[PDB]
């Protein structure tokens, strides 16, 4: 099997409803005060293989 073909979506603060589909593969960023006090930082890729 694929070495890095299996991944999980690291996330927080937005508790989700059970039994729903997530296809919004977007890198997490805020661009406001609660991310290093600036815009564009803390832009870590949520998916971990």
């Amino acid at each position: 099997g694929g070495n890095y073909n299996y991944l999980y979506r690291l996330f927080r603060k937005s508790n989700l409803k059970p039994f729903e589909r997530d296809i919004s593969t977007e890198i997490y960023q805020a661009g406001s005060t609660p991310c290093n006090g600036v815009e564009g930082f803390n832009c870590y890729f949520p998916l971990q293989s």
Binding site: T33, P34, N36, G37, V38
Partner: protein, 49 residues
């Protein structure tokens, strides 16, 4: 500060300090903690530090 092999230790207790005043400060290279929420630390009570 002391050396890496002879670091200093101090006892701190009965304090009321806010973790939000330091999280937003940009004078830190990085602020990543293992299992400790930087945002929710303001609502946490600890036996000792």
């Amino acid at each position: 500060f002391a050396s890496v092999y002879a670091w200093n230790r101090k006892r701190i207790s009965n304090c009321v300090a806010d973790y939000s005043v330091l999280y937003n400060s940009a004078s830190f290279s990085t602020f990543k903690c293992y299992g400790v929420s930087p945002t929710k630390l303001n609502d946490l009570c600890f036996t000792n530090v």
